């Protein structure tokens, strides 16, 4: 047992707030935001000795990474920026850093009560997306 057991299923999203805002924030444009706020992602997450994979399928995109904590890749996200990312473990905390024409944005995973957490943040602006078992 290891790292991330706690994370490792398939999650489905069932709250969303602030994410319209988060978006703007990013520089999601008006058409993608639209579309891409409609859509109740499943989150996939899965451990392969030190590698960890994360799947998003949904009606817009399917999008799918695998990295090795603390190794920077290359990224190019659901809203189609080409990014580079460092994702590290914090207390229990899967810590998610992407960056892109010299801006920055972190989105934090945790596990609590049945629930998985996400936290975006893009400057002063915080989204939360919870998502529960499948
Ligand atoms: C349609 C859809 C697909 C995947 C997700 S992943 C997101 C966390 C990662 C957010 C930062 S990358 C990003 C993705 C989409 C947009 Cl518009 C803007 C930024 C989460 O809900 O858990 C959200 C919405």
Same mark, same amino acid.
């Given at each position: 047992?290891?790292? *991330?057991?706690?994370?490792?299923?398939?999650?489905?999203? !069932? #709250?969303?707030?602030?994410?319209?805002?988060?978006?703007?924030?990013? @520089?999601?444009?008006?058409?993608?935001?639209?579309?891409?706020?409609?859509?109740?992602?499943?989150?996939?997450?899965? !451990?392969?000795?030190?590698?960890?994979?994360?799947?998003?399928? #949904?009606?817009?995109?399917?999008?799918?990474?695998?990295?090795?904590? @603390?190794?920077?890749?290359?990224?190019?996200?659901?809203?189609?920026?080409? !990014?580079? #990312?460092?994702?590290?473990?914090?207390?229990?905390?899967?810590?998610?850093?992407?960056?892109?024409? @010299?801006?920055?944005?972190?989105?934090?995973?945790?596990?609590?009560?049945?629930?998985?957490?996400?936290? *975006?943040?893009?400057?002063? !602006?915080?989204?939360?997306?919870?998502?529960?078992?499948?």
């Amino acid at each position: 047992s290891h790292m *991330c057991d706690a994370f490792v299923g398939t999650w489905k999203l !069932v #709250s969303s707030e602030n994410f319209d805002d988060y978006m703007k924030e990013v @520089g999601v444009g008006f058409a993608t935001r639209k579309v891409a706020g409609m859509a109740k992602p499943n989150m996939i997450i899965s !451990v392969n000795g030190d590698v960890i994979t994360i799947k998003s399928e #949904s009606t817009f995109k399917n999008t799918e990474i695998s990295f090795i904590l @603390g190794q920077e890749f290359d990224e190019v996200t659901a809203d189609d920026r080409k !990014v580079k #990312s460092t994702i590290t473990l914090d207390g229990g905390v899967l810590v998610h850093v992407q960056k892109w024409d @010299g801006k920055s944005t972190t989105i934090k995973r945790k596990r609590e009560d049945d629930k998985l957490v996400v936290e *975006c943040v893009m400057k002063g !602006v915080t989204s939360t997306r919870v998502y529960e078992r499948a």
